[PDB]
Write an enzyme that holds these catalytic residues in place. Structure first.
Site, PDB file in Angstrom:
ATOM      1  CD  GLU A   1      57.565  65.070  16.361  1.00 56.62           C
ATOM      2  OE1 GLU A   1      57.691  64.152  16.561  1.00 56.62           O
ATOM      3  OE2 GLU A   1      56.217  65.454  16.509  1.00 56.62           O
TER       4      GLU A   1
ATOM      5  CD  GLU B   1      52.602  64.276  25.048  1.00 51.93           C
ATOM      6  OE1 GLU B   1      52.604  64.793  26.390  1.00 51.93           O
ATOM      7  OE2 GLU B   1      52.854  63.371  24.604  1.00 51.93           O
TER       8      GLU B   1
END
Ligand SMILES: O[C@@H]1[C@@H](O)[C@H](O[C@@H]2CO[C@@H](O[C@@H]3CO[C@@H](O)[C@H](O)[C@H]3O)[C@H](O)[C@H]2O)OC[C@H]1O
Length: 190
Positions: free
Chosen positions: A86, A177
């Site tokens: 990631e 986010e």
């Protein structure tokens, strides 16, 4: 339009929207490369638009508005597989530096700013393959911005020099986010 968590393609752009099941987030796909997020006392979420699959040399452009009230970041966000990785190239953030707790690996200069690079291991955490363990890489822009172009190759190369092996590219998006916060964002990707 506004959607629940999921993935797909919209107006030629891949999108991914994920949340932890807590309320307080509204994710909307718009025309072309545009998406918006509006959130109020959210939980954890991340979503946005880009490519599936991404590439190891993409130059990613973004513009628009980014106005978090609390813990949030705006990034180029993606994954590889085999190995599972990631990664985040963080262009702006709110009240918390999301590289906190990760190990600094050095610095890279790209697209008008120095970035600090980091990695950390995530253990039994959500991922594109389900609960998994994987390294998570960060490159955090010192000179924060909400529009710009990102030469991803400069970040991938900087990480590789300290031991990243990128596998097969999976999705690659410009994402917003949030983490137990409020905010809005309206971003156009190209
Ligand atoms: O249904 C499954 C999806 O829920 C899954 O989505 C991914 C789950 O992990 C998400 O990860 C972000 C991992 O790290 C923090 O960095 C993010 O906060 C995690 O939630 C990711 O964004 C989702 O794409 O994909 C597999 C599906 O089977």
């Amino acid at each position: 339009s506004t959607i629940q968590p999921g993935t797909g393609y919209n107006n030629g752009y891949f999108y991914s929207y994920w949340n932890d099941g807590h309320g307080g987030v509204t994710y909307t796909n718009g025309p072309g490369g545009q998406f918006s997020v509006n959130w109020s006392n959210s939980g954890d979420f991340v979503g946005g638009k880009g490519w599936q699959p991404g590439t190891k040399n993409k130059v990613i452009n973004f513009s628009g508005s980014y106005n978090p009230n609390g813990n949030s970041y705006l990034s180029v966000y993606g994954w590889s597989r085999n190995p599972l990785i990631e990664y985040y190239i963080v262009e702006n953030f709110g009240t918390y530096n999301p590289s906190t707790g990760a190990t600094k690996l050095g610095e890279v200069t790209s697209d008008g700013s120095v970035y600090d690079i980091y990695r950390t291991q995530r253990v039994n955490q959500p991922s594109i393959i389900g609960t998994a363990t994987f390294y998570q890489y960060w490159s955090v822009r010192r000179n924060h911005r909400s529009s710009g172009s990102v030469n991803t190759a400069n970040h991938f190369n900087a990480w590789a020099q300290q031991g990243l092996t990128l596998g097969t590219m999976d999705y690659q998006i410009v994402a917003v986010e949030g983490y137990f916060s409020s905010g809005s964002a309206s971003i156009t990707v190209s």
